Amino acid sequence: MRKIRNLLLTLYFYFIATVYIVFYGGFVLFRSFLMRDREKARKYVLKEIEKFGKRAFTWLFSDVVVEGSENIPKDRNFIVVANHQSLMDIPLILGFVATGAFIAKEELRKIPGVNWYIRYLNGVFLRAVRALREAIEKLKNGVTFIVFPEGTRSPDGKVLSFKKDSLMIAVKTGVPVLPVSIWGTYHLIPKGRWTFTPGKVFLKIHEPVDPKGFSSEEELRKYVEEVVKRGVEELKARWSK
Numbered sequence: 516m517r518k519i520r521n522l523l524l525t526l527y528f529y530f531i532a533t534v535y536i537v538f539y540g541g542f543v544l545f546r547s548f549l550m551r552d553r554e555k556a557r558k559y560v561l562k563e564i565e566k567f568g569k570r571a572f573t574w575l576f577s578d579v580v581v582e583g584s585e586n587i588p589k590d591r592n593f594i595v596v597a598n599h600q601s602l603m604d605i606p607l608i609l610g611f612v613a614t615g616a617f618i619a620k621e622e623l624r625k626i627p628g629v630n631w632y633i634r635y636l637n638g639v640f641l642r643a644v645r646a647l648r649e650a651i652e653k654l655k656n657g658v659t660f661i662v663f664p665e666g667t668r669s670p671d672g673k674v675l676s677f678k679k680d681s682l683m684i685a686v687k688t689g690v691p692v693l694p695v696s697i698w699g700t701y702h703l704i705p706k707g708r709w710t711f712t713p714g715k716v717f718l719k720i721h722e723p724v725d726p727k728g729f730s731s732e733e734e735l736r737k738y739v740e741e742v743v744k745r746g747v748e749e750l751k752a753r754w755s756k
């Protein structure tokens with residue numbers, strides 16, 4: 516019966532999430548297209564995305580809690596660097612940190628609704644990684660990125676090593692890295708499971724890092740890695756309620 520509840524929750528999530536992304540999200544872009552004033556059209560679409568990020572977790576009866584909102588740069592783009600432990604990490608970062616570009620599986624272009632919004636956020640689909648050039652290029656024009664240097668979701672919640680050259684997009688653009696630590700989306704929906712289970716999600720936003728202060732990509736990566744990791748640990752251990 517705890518199984519019944521979770522499955523029904525799962526159905527409720529996919530149904531609402533799909534109708535919301537496709538039909539309401541179609542409607543959103545459709546209204547934004549009709550807007551004379553292009554700057555506020557952008558604001559409208561962006562705000563709706565952020566609202567989706569947030570609303571997502573309400574559809575799961577899962578409470579988000581954010582600290583370090585004050586650290587998120589304003590007037591400027593950045594590269595969110597986060598640990599990765601669920602599909603829900605993307606809606607989480609979108610709704611509570613930044614509505615930026617991300618790197619999608621080639622697959623995703625074909626899924627309706629999602630592709631329109633990945634494109635709107637100026638995302639980057641995956642010779643074998645030409646990606647890196649668009650990301651760099653997009654960064655230079657001013658797009659915020661969201662980057663999961665581990666390169667995969669942790670299977671057990673534990674933070675994996677940051678893949679070598681993972682912070683190269685910061686090094687080669689000079690845009691600030693905004694380290695973020697996510698805890699609880701893994702208990703919500705873990706790698707390889709297709710069902711949800713409610714729970715609390717915590718998010719800790721850390722002080723922006725300037726790549727300028729680092730003799731190499733490899734030294735920056737290590738700094739950000741300890742920062743993120745330590746967050747996860749503090750978050751994993753905090754009692755609350």
Ligand SMILES: CCCCCCCCC
Pocket residue numbers: 535536539540543563564567568605629632633
């Ligand atoms: C109302 C528009 C919602 C779009 C959510 C986008 C999710 C991007 C993966």
